[PDB]
Amino acid sequence: MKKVVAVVKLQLPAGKATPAPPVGPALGQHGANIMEFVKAFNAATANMGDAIVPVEITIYADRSFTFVTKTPPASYLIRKAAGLEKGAHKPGREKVGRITWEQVLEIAKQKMPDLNTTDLEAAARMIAGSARSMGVEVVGAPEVKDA
Numbered sequence: 001m002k003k004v005v006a007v008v009k010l011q012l013p014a015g016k017a018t019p020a021p022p023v024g025p026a027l028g029q030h031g032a033n034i035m036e037f038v039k040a041f042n043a044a045t046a047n048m049g050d051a052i053v054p055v056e057i058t059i060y061a062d063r064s065f066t067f068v069t070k071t072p073p074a075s076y077l078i079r080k081a082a083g084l085e086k087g088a089h090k091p092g093r094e095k096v097g098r099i100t101w102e103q104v105l106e107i108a109k110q111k112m113p114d115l116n117t118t119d120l121e122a123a124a125r126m127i128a129g130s131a132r133s134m135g136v137e138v139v140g141a142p143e144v145k146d147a
Contacts, residue, residue, distance in 0.1 A: 001061040006030075008057035015050030017042050032063050040068075048072050074130045077107050082136055097131065101140030104128050 008023060017038050021027065028034055045051065048070050058066040070076075075084075081103045083096060108123035117123055128138045 003060060004058055005061040006057075006059040008055070008059065010055070011052060012041070012055050013050070013052050014045035014048060015042060017045065027057075030059065030063060032065065037065060044068065044070060048076070071111065074127060074134060078127070078131060078134075078136070081107060082131075088135065097134075097136030098139055099128075099131060099136060101138060104131070104138060 008027065010022070012021075019034060019038065021038075024034075027037065045053070049072065051072075053069045055067050055069060060066070075082075078099065081099045083098065104127045105120060105124060108120070108127040111123055111127065112118070128141070131138065
């Protein structure tokens with residue numbers, strides 16, 4: 001028994017997971033608990049939705065699998081900072097989706113723990129611009145003449 005003894009470096013599909021992974025035995029022999037493995041996975045990938053995520057299941061001989069990923073594209077925290085209850089629907093004049101500049105920033109800041117990004121303006125345009133993709137507006141974005 002020592003520090004990290006097995007690292008499962010590979011891709012994994014959010015949700016759409018099952019007792020039939022490429023590892024299975026290569027992971028089961030550990031003795032741990034498969035269902036537990038998948039549970040925490042599926043359970044988190046389910047809490048976030050089905051998708052694809054690169055992971056390196058850091059397994060320590062003490063029989064412990066360290067590994068957690070999340071932070072969906074936008075709706076992740078946008079859902080709150082925005083204000084989407086039921087969701088999208090037929091066109092309407094109600095107009096919804098208003099996030100503030102600082103809020104999208106902080107949300108666009110911790111968004112890159114070690115990603116190839118450090119420019120606020122980039123991550124900003126991402127969360128914001130992405131919002132534009134989705135269908136939201138930012139209360140902060142000067143670019144219109146007053147006359």
